Amino acid sequence: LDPQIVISGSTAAFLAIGRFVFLGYQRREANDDLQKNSTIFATNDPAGFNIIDVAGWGALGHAVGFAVLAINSLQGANLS
Amino acid sequence: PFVPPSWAPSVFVPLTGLVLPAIAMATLFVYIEKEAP
Amino acid sequence: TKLFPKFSQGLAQDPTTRRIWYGLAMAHDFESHDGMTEENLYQKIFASHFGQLSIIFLWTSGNLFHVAWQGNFEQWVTDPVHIRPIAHAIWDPHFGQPAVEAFTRGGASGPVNISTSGVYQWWYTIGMRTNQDLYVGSVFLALVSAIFLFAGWLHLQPNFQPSLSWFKDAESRLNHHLSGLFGVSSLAWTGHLVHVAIPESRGQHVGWDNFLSVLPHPQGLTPFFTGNWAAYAQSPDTASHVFGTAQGSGQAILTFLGGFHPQTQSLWLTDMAHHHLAIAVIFIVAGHMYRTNFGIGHRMQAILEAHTPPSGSLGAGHKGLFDTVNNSLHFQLGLALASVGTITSLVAQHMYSLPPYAFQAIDFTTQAALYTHHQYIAGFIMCGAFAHGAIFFIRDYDPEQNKGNVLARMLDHKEALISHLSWVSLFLGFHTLGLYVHNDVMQAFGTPEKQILIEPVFAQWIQAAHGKALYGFDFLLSSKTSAAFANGQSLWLPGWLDAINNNQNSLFLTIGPGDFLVHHAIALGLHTTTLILVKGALDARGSKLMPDKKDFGYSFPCDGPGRGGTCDISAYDAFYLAVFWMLNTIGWVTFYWHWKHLTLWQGNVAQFDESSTYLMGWLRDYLWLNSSQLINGYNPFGMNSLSVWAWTFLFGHLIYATGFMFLISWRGYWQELIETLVWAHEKTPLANLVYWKDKPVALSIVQARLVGLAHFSVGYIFTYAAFLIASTSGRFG
Amino acid sequence: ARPTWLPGLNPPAHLKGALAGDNGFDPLGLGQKWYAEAEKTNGRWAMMAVAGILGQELLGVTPAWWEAGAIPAQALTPIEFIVMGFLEIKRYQGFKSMATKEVKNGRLAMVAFIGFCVQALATRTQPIEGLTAHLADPFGKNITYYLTHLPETLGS
Amino acid sequence: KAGNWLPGSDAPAWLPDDLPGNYGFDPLSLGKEPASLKRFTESEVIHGRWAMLGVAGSLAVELLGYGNWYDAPLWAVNGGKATWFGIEVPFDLNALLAFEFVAMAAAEGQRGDAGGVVYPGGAFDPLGFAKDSSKSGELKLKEIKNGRLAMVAFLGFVAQHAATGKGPIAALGEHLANPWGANFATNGISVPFF
Amino acid sequence: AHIVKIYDTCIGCTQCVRACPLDVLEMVPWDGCKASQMASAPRTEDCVGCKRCETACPTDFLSVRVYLGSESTRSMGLSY
């Protein structure tokens, strides 16, 4: 498997579902100076999808993407 | 350079077994019997 | 008034020898100190934790320094099988010439002690090869010790004292500890194995001077970034590899061989590297679960409030438990001790059966010492967990704030819990003792065929499920036609099945009726110890006998001879009783482990299989038979290197017996006796010129229990340690 | 409304924009004065170090900057320890448009120096040497190539 | 009320009379809590609808002659190629997982937000059989009864295959050939002491 | 010094006062019980903590309670 299509595809899929499908569900579930949300990560995205969400759904995509590459690499392996 | 001299045990064993305990007991004894103002 | 102790004005005004004793005993009970505030309490604990850390690293520095300075590590690595590790040198002016000669062993110039801690096998497995390696590690850990000691001082200073809210940020601490303290540390240890330990086991030196120019794998990170992760599993070390040399060595760095290295009879270094890499990923991910300053993750309070069964079977469920746990340091410490206490036992059970360190299995004394060492520590830690659970109920528990939740409902059926624990303990005691006694009588009358020998089929069935073909059950990993056997047949089953079907190691030892009886003895010990500790916790706040017990605190002498008599009614006394049972239980566990390995190591498992079904067999064949070399360490005809253990053996018996004095004879007798001595001193010329500053008194009721238990416990431990080491090393040394 | 490190992002309250080079960048909330001085001193050293590495290579000084360490060194350290102590202590005691340009150039140097270190380990090439390789073959020579050809880099 | 599962008994009070498929069967009183019953009502229909498709798919494959339901995915493990009505499907296992996870998450995510709606109608009822909502009671009873039967049938497929290893149609032919000598009582598995 | 408390369940039977070996307790007028007297603990600096008073109390649960406290020469019962 080519790493670019697999990792890009999985990342694209997980960003889409996080923005169009489960964004509403996550927001409903989601809803001394080192413990306060001092910086509000404001975004111009119409649906409220901000950088923190991008890191989260993007991280899942990368993790799932490498799992596909790792599992496939085993097939045809020697001494393993 | 880390190796201590061959005579170190002859000094440190008496030092930590007789001398330092004697000082510690004497120091502690005076402290625990000291009267507060 | 006396200054000491500064933290208790009530003690400082005590005019008797009580004050010094209680000044020491109450020193670390911060909550009871004069003027203590919640915020100051947390800051004091934080500084103390830095003190513990520096002590631990200094202790590790000392062990590294003395082995490098006085050990034979460099000689040991050339022939670990036939050389005894040296712990440190002896310098004792009380020795006679014969003792100097006797303890001169292992190739050292002068008298030395033989190490039983297994640090040699551990340091050798991780890549240490020369005394210079040990020296540098020693200096590094001393520096780390100093830094932690300084950090403890620093965070006590006015501008570096964390606020109370900082200490109560559960979500943030869990995130960092799971991903950083657990995950990154595990990831970093993987790097050491890949970059240093694995190359060293293949005859290549990798150190700080060249580790940036040596490739851990012939393909450097190319497989990692392209997803071809199987490139790292190719060409593992062969079955003929000689540890520490390049002969028969491979190139893989991440494998799943799943057995033992044939020469060292320990876990593969490439399996231990892949283990920590996978654990690191799991923990790093787990550390992104809880909410912090970034608007994602879980709030722990929200999770707890949600988990309430709809039927009302748990009442209010977990409502209010976030504040209960978060506001109680004793609830937290109870949880920490219970978790670490169980983990310590897991370490003991897994390290003997799946030895991770090279040449650990063949060092019989080290194997025995390590299992016994960690199981006793686990036993003490478990008692503490329940002790602080009982302290929680008194000091911290608030019935109003836990109304109807699971915690308050445990108190609602405490009689049901205690009475069922009582039934289980009675059943196990009656029938386990009964069966042993029946077998002793059958043995005594010369009819061993009439004894009751119940096969442990349930446990043998589990062993068969894991691939042990001895019992013929033949299913799961024991059945060659099962899906479980087939699916893993290319990953780890070949190595695992080879190891589990070899009866010369400790991986799922064969078991029989003798193993059946002793396992029910262990269950008797666990249940009875839990009964005493649980009863102590659940009755800590009150009973029908003492309804207002919570008004008297965790530890107090008694409530007097009234109402029938109330000796040992406090929750503290329940813990005191429980320690005796913990020692008895661990004693049964370790006796079992030791005797079963002694007969395996001697090639005669039949002796255990035939003698362990009755108690005279344990007395005659385990204790009496294996004491012979120990008690001859010195005698009228001379002495040998076991004289120290012979002396310590009796030393242990003496301390043990001295403890019986404090446990059996109680205070009033001694207080009257001391008064006659007070009279005598004042009436004696030339001696009444000297006088005391603290009026002598007998030890207090509570203090006698603790001191007596301490003597009992120390003598218990020392006696067995001497017997364990001397009987094993003398046999195999 | 000053420019912000993220489009349409409200600057944090604890950063009022008074300090030089204040882009309202503090997601972790560490800034909730000493750090401002700390940024300059770390930045100032980075600028001197970055200039030295680039300058030394251009003049042909050898060996590589990371190999420069290899008067005896054992005798230099006591001198440097004593010499630098007085300057730092006196500097600390005094503390106890140009500004914006100083910080921005200082920040660039700090990021630049880390590039030198990571590039050396990953590429074994000095900053000018690495730059020339990229210009000659941009697509061919980049992080993707070097990360996937470490054996060749260390095969010399 | 649909009927009585145990003639002569009394319906539990927590099962309303107008609930489709209400035979008064709740011996463990799982639906005693009204909030729990609401979730169970939705879940039963969903399980029945999937089971009805699953049983039809399992039977259709074996009747048409493309193996049994159990052997359908073996191509993805033996290096084979996917087929459908004998038509080769170019996709491989990894591609199929991607399509299914994305598609089902989108469709199931949409249904979840609806808030436990079990009879959407509208776009899901193009022919408008239940559009009236007056006669829908009879149809809802038919759906739940056929759905319950399908759920029981599918468990019969899994259980029967685990015992004899044959496909449901093959097992039926085996029973018909020798009804008294080929049944659950003669597997040697279901009843150990026979 | 130990802490001795009398609770409003006292019936004024006087048995705790009669049993005290240190003369810590005494009876005072009261109106809350039929006997019109309640136990009192005026001299607690002399209490040794023997709890003979608690042994003598008939009420259930106790009406006189001793909480052992800081130790002095008097409370320890020393004659030296």
Ligand code: CLA
């Ligand atoms: C001052 C910034 C800077 C510049 C102009 C360059 C320029 C170059 N780098 Mg270098 N590099 C830098 C910083 C920089 N680097 C840093 C900080 C690191 C460590 C992460 C590296 C690590 C690195 C490697 C490993 C390699 C290069 C390489 C290269 C060359 C090809 C470009 C490439 O493939 O980059 C790809 C990789 C990068 C890291 C480029 C990053 C560029 C962006 C603009 C950096 C933005 C940083 C950001 C503001 C930090 C935010 C922090 C956050 C906490 C807020 C080229 C000469 C390649 C080469 O051929 O070297 C000889 C090569 O192999 N660089």
Ligand code: CLA
């Ligand atoms: C780690 C602690 C430690 C150490 C280092 C020693 C050391 C010694 N013990 Mg032991 N001892 C210890 C603990 C220790 N003991 C404990 C805890 C106990 C109680 C259980 C005992 C009980 C004990 C007994 C009963 C005896 C010893 C004796 C000895 C000596 C044996 C060698 C010999 O033949 O000396 C022969 C004596 C000499 C060569 C004289 C050495 C110098 C003397 C002791 C001091 C001189 C001081 C000087 C005049 C003025 C101060 C000088 C100073 C400032 C430098 C030696 C000095 C024997 C002995 O001789 O004791 C005096 C002896 O009989 N010990």
Ligand code: CLA
């Ligand atoms: C993380 C571990 C941990 C921590 C932080 C604490 C902390 C605390 N415990 Mg807990 N505890 C723990 C583990 C822990 N415990 C364990 C493992 C047990 C089971 C053994 C207990 C059992 C326990 C009890 C039963 C009690 C506490 C109490 C306390 C409090 C006061 C401690 C004190 O003043 O001790 C002072 C300590 C001493 C004076 C020293 C005691 C020494 C013992 C007896 C061993 C002596 C060995 C001997 C010297 C060896 C000689 C060898 C020879 C060869 C020379 C404090 C909050 C007390 C309390 O009031 O809590 C509210 C209390 O009653 N703990």
Ligand code: CLA
């Ligand atoms: C070898 C010594 C010993 C023995 C046998 C026991 C036995 C018992 N202890 Mg005890 N205990 C001991 C030492 C011992 N303890 C010590 C040293 C301490 C520390 C102070 C404690 C502290 C302690 C606590 C705190 C608790 C126990 C409990 C128990 C019971 C555990 C359950 C059990 O075994 O039921 C089966 C019973 C037995 C095995 C007892 C022996 C029964 C014999 C064989 C009957 C023989 C009858 C026969 C006809 C002969 C009669 C002759 C006669 C008429 C002349 C049991 C009665 C727990 C308990 O009560 O649980 C309900 C409990 O809470 N023990």
Ligand SMILES: CC1=C(/C=C/C(C)=C/C=C/C(C)=C/C=C/C=C(C)/C=C/C=C(C)/C=C/C2=C(C)CCCC2(C)C)C(C)(C)CCC1
């Ligand atoms: C009193 C109290 C307390 C205390 C407590 C304690 C001390 C406890 C302990 C406890 C314990 C100590 C417990 C334990 C448990 C355990 C468990 C529960 C386990 C489980 C396991 C499992 C489940 C497993 C499984 C498996 C197997 C077996 C094999 C294969 C694999 C697997 C994984 C599957 C506290 C503090 C809370 C407070 C309150 C009060």
Ligand SMILES: CCCCCCCCCCCCO[C@H]1O[C@H](CO)[C@@H](O[C@H]2O[C@H](CO)[C@@H](O)[C@H](O)[C@H]2O)[C@H](O)[C@H]1O
């Ligand atoms: C082989 C078969 C495999 C089957 C795998 C099934 C995986 C299921 C994962 C579900 C993850 C959560 O996803 C699901 O969460 C909620 C239901 O719980 C739904 O969301 C809804 O749930 C709440 C509780 O019922 C409702 O009150 C709200 O309308 C809404 O929040 C989401 O729209 C849905 O996406």
Ligand code: SF4
């Ligand atoms: S405890 Fe003893 S001395 Fe004190 S009041 Fe009661 S009876 Fe009197």
